[model samples]
Target chain A: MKIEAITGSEAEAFHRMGSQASHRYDEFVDLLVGAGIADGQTVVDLCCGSGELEVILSSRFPSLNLVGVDLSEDMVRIAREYAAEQGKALEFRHGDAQLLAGMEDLAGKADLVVSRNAFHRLTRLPAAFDTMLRLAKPGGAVLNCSFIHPSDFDESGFRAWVTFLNQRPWDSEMQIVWALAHHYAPRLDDYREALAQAARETPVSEQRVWIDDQGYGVPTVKCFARRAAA
Target chain B: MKIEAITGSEAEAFHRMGSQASHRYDEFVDLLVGAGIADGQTVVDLCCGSGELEVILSSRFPSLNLVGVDLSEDMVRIAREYAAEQGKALEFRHGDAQLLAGMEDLAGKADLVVSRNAFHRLTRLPAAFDTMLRLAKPGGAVLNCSFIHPSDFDESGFRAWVTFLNQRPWDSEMQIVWALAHHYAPRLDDYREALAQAARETPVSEQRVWIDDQGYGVPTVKCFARRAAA
Candidate 1:
């Protein structure tokens, strides 16, 4: 089930707070760069809340066309405004990542397709993976990275997660945010299976499982799939 | 400088909370097991607060002769009591890990010498390493694993840490505990350098840097040094 959209000021605040709280941006960029994002290439970031990825990419790789897509209009507006303020030419569109294949203009256009830490929010996981694959040009790369909850957490790990959620006296807003996070967090096996199923034609080129400390030690998985050459 | 000991009920509470907060115990056990902790092996855990390590080792490896040493007398008492309650035959002593060489009975006696997340509290890091080496029998293993604070945290990581500490409305006791933790936290470089210096004679056999998610993404270093055979 999709979480009720967090919009307006709340969305803005969440973006700000989340950016401050997690150090995943740099690591995310490194992963993208390693996936062979080059100068003047089209990079599409699915579920690109507040266009943070666009901002980082524009600064690091000049002359690149960056497109950010999100389901939230509030996020799109903030992303557009952020790009404008930074004088970066980035396209921030309000669109569902799950339906990207239907967007005629974007089909077979992206040299590098990416989504970071937003896969859990998707109800249509297979569709999203297909869209990511469809959006990438032949020989292009699609990198999807998200946090995964391991099935076998040792006693301390389980306790730590419990304490992390329960020990801190969170405000009402934070409590709600955390609740949504808990409800939507996907298991590692489920994520792997979904990706494997969806990328039948465009077989996954590489996959990595590492602890993403930025998410408070949540295990993160990155799946990189290359569109087969024509 | 050595931070003042957190004694009395505070220590007990800390142990309980800390135990619940991280799943390092199982991972620690796995590491020991992988290091070939066979039956009847003598295992010495420096900084073994409340004898938790002893309890685990004894239960897991029935023939193991476990000895725990910590600087806190309060911790020693609690540890002794814990061992008694569990009906485990283990020795708990209150002594500084740095001066372990002075204990004639323990010198060159341990098949496995280990310290987990405790090396940062030491002021005499080199000496502590020396003690670890001295306590290990020839061809024995010395495993030191501790949390590390990276010097190269990006702006987001720094901000996250600040927000993490500030946003929580901690009570006085928690504040003191946090302060002590901050005061004693060691940098990754410092830890590596000290271990390198100490293992000059006992050369490090294996070293690994991995995120110990149990501590909320704190980078943990595990240095395994095997004492040279005659």
Candidate 2:
């Protein structure tokens, strides 16, 4: 199925409300640090919506070169504006993760390539993986993080959770966006196989990184796989 | 999130409409044979909603001992009645996949522990995996099958697909039932991690089996993990 792009005010509102409600900003920063991101390293966020990760990383690591790419032009514009407002020097580009391999400038340049909660929306998963690998320096790391249903919530509980999210007093347009997004969100098991396949075919070494509950109403997974050094 | 049970007429009607619409009865039979399920082998279907699998298997392989378990009481009753109507001797019980490890009589008794399109409904996936492992003979197989979005459909297409299913003039109540089920259907990536984890802790070899388009508007994955022979 094709993903309907969330653009304009709705996209910005989605980023604002989703970033706030999830309360994952700090946790995401922590995860990046734990993944061994360091100052002066080049980091690329694929499917980086609204430049939240770029903005956060820039504030924390002044020497780090940050770049963000997203398919939605409106989202890219918002991300660029958001980063500019934050007084962070960042590069935000309109690009699709599924076609990242075609971006010659980005290939083999990043110290870290990351996508959080966005790969699930891509239609071409294998192509996305190949692109991630292609963009990473031989020794660079690739990380993809996404949420999954909590192990303890039964069917009724999950439905209730969805209802609660829908009932929240967010922008009605953003609400519809979130509903469609959640309807297509990928589970943790999905990531495992994709990563495993990538590792099996390439020089990437896969590892699992634990994510504590960030109050997203579900557990999240941070998958870390490193390309073998040249 | 709590799962609203499909009980009463809604439950029976769901089985009737769902079975007829998907036409998975023959495909399921073919899958079982492909999985090497032979006459006289004991098979346990976890989350065996309405015992469609049991009824089909019994008719085709009368010597195959079949047992089906599901959390829905109404479904179990309907399954029992349906099997009896076919003059097939089968066992249908109200049980939960997450708690199957506690069934002393079933421990290590099944030549195949199988589930279809239901594991995503489960809240406690790891527990279910453990239970599946516990019930499987040392050399038995654990198979999980479920539908996933096709690589090409975009969000609008997927929404249209859902609309198509809901618009069908079957039981109206079954429409709601199917909607809720679709909302919670797990992606193939979700199964990858669970099966990988199971393989890591046990002597299970994993393989992916293709399931032809079953007119479900998406491709289905049949994950087969075989336990090491005793």
Residue by residue across B7-90, what tens digits does model 1's lDDT show?
A: 787778766665444444777777888788988998889888877778777887888988888888999888888888889978
> Which whole-number lDDT from 0 to 100 does residue B96 have in model 2?
85
Highest-DockQ candidate: 2
What TM-score against the true fold does each predicted structure earn? 0.49, 0.50
Error of 2 at A162 (Å): 2.8
Candidate 2 lDDT tens digits, B78-111: 8888788778889988888888543669887789
Interface RMSD of candidate 2? 5.9
**lDDT, candidates in the order shown:** 0.70, 0.70
Query: Once superposed on the true structure, which residue ranges of model 1 sit more than 4 Å away at CA?
Result: A1-5, A18-23, A150-179, A201-218, B1-11, B14-230
Pick out the ten consecutive residues of candidate 1 chain A with the lowest summed lDDT: A150-159
Error of 1 at A46 (Å): 0.2
For every prediction, compared with the true complex, DockQ reads: 0.02, 0.11
Instruction: Tell me how far candidate 1 lies from the true structure as C-alpha RMSD in angstroms.
Output: 14.4
